[PDB]
RNA sequence: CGCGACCUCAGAUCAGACGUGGCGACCCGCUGAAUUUAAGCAUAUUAGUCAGCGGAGGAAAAGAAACUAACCAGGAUUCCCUCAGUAACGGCGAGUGAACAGGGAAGAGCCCAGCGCCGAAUCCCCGCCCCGCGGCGGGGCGCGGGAAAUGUGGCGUACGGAAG
């Protein structure tokens, strides 16, 4: 066999994947950020309740590692209601105020007085 | 225009809070800390300032693992044993 | 600026001497430390002599001190081979050995050989196995009389 | 009633997880009651539910890891969270076998020439 | 600066929460020496660093 | 035994056989890099009498120390002080290039421990030393009792406390009347014992 | 081909052994035993091999 | 041309380990000033000191003579008293300045390479069985892999040693 290109490059060798004799950590770590510990409490301010009675949404305080997809999946599991969209912001306190706009078949006022805020 | 009117242009900052020592001494253009020497792997530490040593040594912060290893030394690092129950 | 009459003096304090000063306030604490460690050692090697092994008659080197005989390092190998003590068994039965010592003389060697023969007369060797005594072991009536001696074993007096 | 860690240990795992998420629901609705403005009974009960969750999770983690080191008790390579966590130099210390290994030179020397048991007549 | 970063904003959030006064039920405690909050910070006087 | 012939052959260095071998080896060692691992020692007999037993866990590095004295690392001339201390050009470093060799080999291999080192060639501008290293956590070393002394934490980085042979040759110690200024632990221990007042309690 | 540095090194070391005036004590290992004598000797040496474990 | 040995040298998220950084009073290696003193100052002095750099341990280092001596001779190292502000160095100016012997604290000695002789007699690692397992070790089994003759182990080291 002959060499066309006058540059010698490193030949491609075989490389195996890991077959370790023991796992590093023995147990997989429990998800400390789950659907209960992601949302903390809904706001009961006058702007919050005016927004739940006008825009058919809810207002929550969540921790800052939450995605919009995570907040959507969390509210869907915790209250069995479908979610149109999510708008998040970080308050000057350091909390993450989330805005969970519901699907139009649900009404935020009856959802609120069954989840306790009224 | 050496003093008061030259203090008006103070609006863009040199340092920022470092992410190893927490002090506002992480230079931005050099990108090295002046308090701990951040990209260097060794902590900046000089014997010509005993006060700058004393401000952050082993005793200063939490000793979050080291007070635990002190009270494990006072029983010789027992492991796997529990006191016998009721 | 010297005054009228007196010595002229050169005190060696021109360096920084206060930063390096050894002060002896742990002198009695260290005496009690040596004493407690010595007593713990003496009861640890429990019937054996407290002063350790036996060390030979040796006279001092120089012109100032050769009239005086003192304790040496260890019994020389020629001394041991004349006294019939094996050079590895001497350190087991409590005889200090050093191989470095020469012997240019005769009566110093004979004094050390007499001292080794007197030591092997004097020592009480317990059996290596307590229930089964052996050949070179002393008898059980002087096993009950064996005890430590304080002070050096056969002190070398001038 | 007042939950405690004695009677949770024979309790099997899915029972502990459903008691856990019941306590999670209860803590969340206590937080809702705190924000809406509830009673001092609810605000006192918040700490009780938090420590309830804490000792249920303690029992779950202990009963998991005891079974883990039972599973790895016989094997030669066991994981790092299961290995003994003494100090670093104390793990890098030679073990009591390799410090007790004696070469054959000094084995036969301490055979032939043992340190005897002697005393000197004064 | 309305173009804050997340680290600087969270730092300012902590300083803003620290700038609140002592709750009045504390100076009914037994061995109390705290008469007020001595480490308070007005935004004209002390410019906080950064 | 062959090692007697090998060590007398290495005693004859200016003879043509060894002069050919040394200049060819020195060419090759210059063509290689600065700190590369040799797979077996070049001088087996010297390696053995320094401590290398060809078992699993001893490695040989072949390192290049740039040859010469030591000029004072100061800007242009400019030592700011008395005319004694304008020494810049003709100063000499207190340790040997063999000790510098083994210390930078031991710094590059921090998990390993320097045993000794020896000489494999020299040029006008470099000298080449092979440094012996021991893997202190390999069990062929660790289960052998008369070489598990190296696996203790007191022997951590011997090359930089100056405890190998070429490190000891610069500490100025040894028995005798030639070495009065090191009795004690070392030279600094000698100085420290001499320049203290023993102020007693009762004086 | 721009060969790697070890291939270049192990070739031009052989070039230097062909260039330099090799002393007879090192030249003498090039004067080597020929083929049919060597295969005869190794056929004989196969009879007296030491044992495996 | 190909195949197969070895040698040099690469690539692996390969199997198992190890080092990194901190404190730094005490310890070891290097680097290393100037104030100051000399009634100035340049050699000296401050001073192998401060600052700088690297590396540890519970102590470090040193350590079992290529020694001291010149005697009727002592005998590893370390520390204390003394030698001694002595011998000696020094614009022989200012200043600097140890050791031997002696008395004590302590006390302990040893091992390789070589020269050799024993069929590599040596070592590491994986698989299986029994035991122990929070300092991965003890035993047996593998026509299991590897290191090693470019030298592992046993005897043997200047006090001699080996063999018959
Ligand atoms: Mg700038
Ligand atoms: Mg540093
Ligand atoms: Mg006057
Ligand atoms: Mg004594
Ligand atoms: Mg041996
Ligand atoms: Mg202002
Ligand atoms: Mg000068
Ligand atoms: Mg020399
Ligand atoms: Mg791997
Ligand atoms: Mg370090
Ligand atoms: Mg002056
Ligand atoms: Mg003056
Ligand atoms: Mg002046
Ligand atoms: Mg000096
Ligand atoms: Mg310093
Ligand atoms: Mg330590
Ligand atoms: Mg030591
Ligand atoms: Mg040592
Ligand atoms: Mg002495
Ligand atoms: Mg006097
Ligand atoms: Mg001086
Ligand atoms: Mg003396
Ligand atoms: Mg051999
Ligand atoms: Mg000797
Ligand atoms: Zn920093």
Swiss-Prot record, chain A:
Modified residues (N6-acetyllysine): 32
Principal subcellular localization: cytoplasm
Superkingdom, taxonomy of origin: Eukaryota
TM region positions: none
Record PTM Citrulline, positions in chain: 3
GO CC annotations, alphabetized: cytosolic large ribosomal subunit; nucleus
Post-translational modification: N-terminus is methylated by METTL11A/NTM1.
A biological-process GO annotation: translation
Cellular localisation: Cytoplasm; Nucleus
Positions where Phosphothreonine occurs in the chain: 7
Keywords, in A-Z order: Acetylation, Citrullination, Cytoplasm, Isopeptide bond, Methylation, Nucleus, Phosphoprotein, Ribonucleoprotein, Ribosomal protein, RNA-binding, rRNA-binding, Ubl conjugation
Residues recorded as bearing Phosphoserine in the entry: 5
Coiled coil regions in record: none
Biased composition (Basic residues): 1-29
GO molecular function, one term: structural constituent of ribosome
Renumbered residue ranges of the record's region Beta-like import receptor binding (BIB) domain: 1-36
Comment on protein domains: The N-terminal beta-like import receptor binding (BIB) domain mediates interaction with IPO5, IPO7, KPNB1 and TNPO1.
Family per similarity comment: Belongs to the universal ribosomal protein uL23 family.
Assembly information from the UniProt record: Component of the large ribosomal subunit. Interacts with LYAR and GNL2. Interacts with MDM2; this interaction may promote MDM2-mediated p53/TP53 polyubiquitination. Directly interacts (via BIB domain) with IPO5, IPO7, KPNB1 and TNPO1; these interactions are involved in RPL23A nuclear import for the assembly of ribosomal subunits. Interacts with IPO8.
Function: Component of the large ribosomal subunit. The ribosome is a large ribonucleoprotein complex responsible for the synthesis of proteins in the cell. Binds a specific region on the 26S rRNA. May promote p53/TP53 degradation possibly through the stimulation of MDM2-mediated TP53 polyubiquitination.
Name used for this protein in its record: Large ribosomal subunit protein uL23
Organism for this UniProt entry: Bos taurus
Residues represented out of the complete protein: 39 to 156 of 156
Swiss-Prot record, chain B:
GO process terms (BP): positive regulation of signal transduction by p53 class mediator; translation
Presence of keyword Zinc: yes
Keywords: Acetylation, Cytoplasm, Metal-binding, Phosphoprotein, Ribonucleoprotein, Ribosomal protein, RNA-binding, rRNA-binding, Zinc, Zinc-finger
Gene Ontology terms, MF aspect: MDM2/MDM4 family protein binding; rRNA binding; structural constituent of ribosome; ubiquitin ligase inhibitor activity; zinc ion binding
GO CC annotations, alphabetized: cytosolic large ribosomal subunit; synapse
Residues that bear N6-acetyllysine: 9
Cysteine pairings via disulfide bonds: none
InterPro entries reported for this sequence: Ribosomal_eL37 (IPR001569), Ribosomal_eL37/eL43 (IPR011331), Ribosomal_eL37_CS (IPR018267), Ribosomal_zn-bd (IPR011332)
Record's subcellular location: Cytoplasm
Binding of Zn(2+), residues: 18, 21, 33, 36
Domain of life: Eukaryota
C4-type zinc-finger residues: 18-36
HAMAP family: Ribosomal_eL37
Functional summary from the UniProt entry: Component of the large ribosomal subunit. The ribosome is a large ribonucleoprotein complex responsible for the synthesis of proteins in the cell.
Subunit structure: Component of the large ribosomal subunit.
Entry similarity comment: Belongs to the eukaryotic ribosomal protein eL37 family.
Protein's recorded name: Large ribosomal subunit protein eL37
Organism encoding this protein: Oryctolagus cuniculus (Rabbit)
Name of the gene: RPL37
Curated annotation (Swiss-Prot), chain D:
Region forming the signal peptide: none
Modified residues (N6-acetyllysine): 18, 42
UniProt entry keywords in alphabetical sequence: Acetylation, Cytoplasm, Isopeptide bond, Phosphoprotein, Ribonucleoprotein, Ribosomal protein, Ubl conjugation
Record location of the Glycyl lysine isopeptide (Lys-Gly) (interchain with G-Cter in SUMO2) cross-link: 24
Xref: Pfam families: Ribosomal_L29
Localization (cell): Cytoplasm
Region listing for Disordered, in residue ranges: 84-122
Transmembrane domains' residue ranges: none
A single GO molecular function term of this UniProt record: mRNA binding
InterPro entries: Ribosomal_uL29, Ribosomal_uL29_CS, Ribosomal_uL29_euk, Ribosomal_uL29_sf
Keyword field contains Ribosomal protein: yes
Main localisation: cytoplasm
Biased composition (Basic residues): 85-95
GO biological processes: maturation of LSU-rRNA from tricistronic rRNA transcript (SSU-rRNA, 5.8S rRNA, LSU-rRNA); translation
Modification sites for Phosphoserine: 28
Subunit structure: Component of the large ribosomal subunit.
Family the UniProt entry places it in: Belongs to the universal ribosomal protein uL29 family.
Name assigned to this protein: Large ribosomal subunit protein uL29
Organism (species): Oryctolagus cuniculus
Swiss-Prot record, chain F:
Matches recorded under SUPFAM superfamilies: Ribosomal proteins S24e, L23 and L15e (SSF54189)
Gene3D superfamilies: Ribosomal protein l15e (3.40.1120.10)
Glycyl lysine isopeptide (Lys-Gly) (interchain with G-Cter in SUMO2) cross-link site: 82
Predominant place of localization: cytoplasm
Composition bias type Basic residues, residue spans: 168-181
Gene Ontology biological-process entries: cytoplasmic translation
SUBUNIT field: Component of the large ribosomal subunit. Interacts with IFIT1 (via TPR repeats 1-4).
Lipidated residue numbers (N-myristoyl glycine): 1
Family per record: Belongs to the eukaryotic ribosomal protein eL15 family.
Gene symbol of the encoding locus: RPL15
Gene Ontology MF, one: structural constituent of ribosome
Residues with the Phosphoserine modification: 33, 96, 99
UniProt keyword terms in alphabetical order: Cytoplasm, Isopeptide bond, Lipoprotein, Myristate, Phosphoprotein, Ribonucleoprotein, Ribosomal protein, Ubl conjugation
Pfam families: Ribosomal_L15e (PF00827)
GO CC terms in record: cytosolic large ribosomal subunit
Task of the protein: Component of the large ribosomal subunit. The ribosome is a large ribonucleoprotein complex responsible for the synthesis of proteins in the cell.
Stored PROSITE patterns: RIBOSOMAL_L15E
InterPro entries: Rbsml_eL15_core_dom_sf, Ribosomal_eL15, Ribosomal_eL15_CS, Ribosomal_uL23/eL15/eS24_sf
Domain of life: Eukaryota
Protein name: Large ribosomal subunit protein eL15
Subcellular localization(s) per the UniProt record: Cytoplasm
Coiled-coil boundaries: none
Region listing for Disordered, in residue ranges: 164-185
């Amino acid at each position: 066999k002959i060499r066309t290109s006058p540059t010698f490059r490193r030949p491609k060798t075989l490389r195996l994947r890991r077959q370790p004799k023991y796992p590093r950590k023995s147990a997989p770590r429990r998800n400390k950020l789950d659907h209960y510990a992601i949302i903390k409490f809904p706001l009961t301010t006058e702007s919050a309740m005016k927004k739940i009675e006008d825009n058919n949404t809810l207002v929550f305080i969540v921790d800052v590692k939450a995605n919009k997809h995570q907040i959507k999946q969390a509210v869907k599991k915790l209250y069995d209601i479908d979610v149109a969209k999510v708008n998040t912001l970080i308050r000057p306190d350091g909390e993450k105020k989330a805005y969970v706009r519901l699907a139009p078949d649900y009404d935020a006022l009856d959802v609120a007085n069954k989840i306790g805020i009224i | 225009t050496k003093g008061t009117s030259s203090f008006g242009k103070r609006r863009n900052k040199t340092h920022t809070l470092c992410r190893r020592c927490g002090s506002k001494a992480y230079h931005l253009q050099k990108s090295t800390c002046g308090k701990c020497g951040y990209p260097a792997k060794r902590k900046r530490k000089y014997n010509w300032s005993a006060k700058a040593k004393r401000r952050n040594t082993t005793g200063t912060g939490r000793m979050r693992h080291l007070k635990i290893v002190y009270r494990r030394f006072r029983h010789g690092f027992r492991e796997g044993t529990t006191p016998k129950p009721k | 600026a010297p005054s009228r009459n007196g010595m002229i003096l050169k005190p060696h304090f021109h360096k920084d001497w206060q930063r390096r000063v050894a002060t002896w306030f742990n002198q009695p604490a260290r005496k009690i430390r040596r004493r407690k460690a010595r007593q713990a050692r003496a009861r640890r090697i429990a019937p054996r002599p407290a002063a350790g092994p036996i060390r030979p008659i040796v006279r001092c080197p120089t012109v100032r001190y050769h009239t005086k005989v003192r304790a040496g390092r260890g019994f020389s190998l020629e001394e041991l081979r004349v006294a019939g003590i094996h050079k590895k068994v001497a350190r087991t039965i409590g005889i200090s050995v050093d191989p470095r010592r020469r012997n240019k003389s005769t009566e110093s060697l004979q004094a050390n050989v007499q001292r080794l023969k007197e030591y092997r007369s004097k020592l009480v060797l317990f059996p290596r196995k307590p229930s089964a005594p052996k050949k070179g072991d002393s008898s059980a009536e002087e096993l009950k009389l064996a005890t430590q001696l304080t002070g050096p074993v056969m002190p070398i007096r001038n | 009633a007042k939950i405690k860690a004695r009677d949770l240990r024979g309790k099997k795992k899915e029972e502990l997880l459903k008691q856990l998420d019941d306590l999670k629901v209860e803590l969340s609705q206590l937080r809702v009651a705190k924000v809406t403005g509830g009673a001092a009974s609810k605000l006192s009960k918040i700490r009780v539910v938090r420590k309830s969750i804490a000792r249920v999770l303690t029992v779950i983690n202990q009963t998991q890891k005891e079974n883990l080191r039972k599973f790895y008790k016989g094997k030669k390579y066991k994981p790092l969270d299961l290995r003994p966590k003494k100090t670093r130099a104390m793990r890098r210390r030679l073990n009591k076998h390799e410090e007790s290994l004696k070469t054959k030179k000094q084995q036969r020397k301490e055979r032939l020439y043992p340190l005897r048991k002697y005393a000197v007549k004064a | 600066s309305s173009h804050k970063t997340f680290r600087i904003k969270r730092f300012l959030a902590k300083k803003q929460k620290q700038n609140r006064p002592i709750p009045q039920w504390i100076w009914m405690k037994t061995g109390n020496k705290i008469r007020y909050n001595s480490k308070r910070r007005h935004w004209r006087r002390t410019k906080l660093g950064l | 035994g062959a090692y007697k012939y090998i060590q007398e052959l290495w005693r004859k260095k200016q003879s043509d056989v060894m002069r050919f071998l040394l200049r060819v080896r020195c060419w090759q060692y210059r063509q290689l890099s600065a700190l590369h691992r040799a797979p077996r020692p070049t001088r087996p007999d010297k390696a053995r009498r320094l401590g290398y037993k060809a078992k699993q866990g001893y490695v040989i590095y072949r390192i290049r120390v740039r040859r010469g004295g030591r000029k004072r690392p100061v800007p242009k001339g400019a030592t700011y002080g008395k005319p004694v201390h304008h020494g810049v050009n003709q100063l000499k470093f207190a340790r040997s290039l063999q000790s510098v060799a083994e210390e930078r080999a031991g710094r590059h291999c921090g998990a390993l421990r320097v045993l000794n080192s020896y000489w494999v060639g020299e040029d006008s501008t470099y000298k080449f030393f092979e440094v012996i290293l021991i893997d202190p956590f390999h069990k062929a070393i660790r289960r052998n009792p008369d070489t598990q002394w190296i696996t203790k934490p007191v022997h951590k980085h011997r090359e930089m406390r100056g405890l190998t042979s070429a490190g000891r040759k610069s500490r100025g110690l040894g028995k005798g009347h030639k070495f009065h200024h090191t009795i004690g632990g070392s030279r600094r221990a000698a100085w420290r014992r001499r320049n203290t007042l023993q102020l007693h309690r009762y004086r | 081909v721009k060969w790697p540095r070890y291939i270049r090194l192990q070739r031009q070391r052989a070039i230097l052994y062909k260039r330099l005036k090799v002393p007879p004590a090192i030249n003498q290992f090039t004067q080597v035993l020929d083929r049919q004598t060597a295969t005869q000797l190794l056929k004989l040496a196969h009879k007296y091999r030491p044992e495996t474990k």
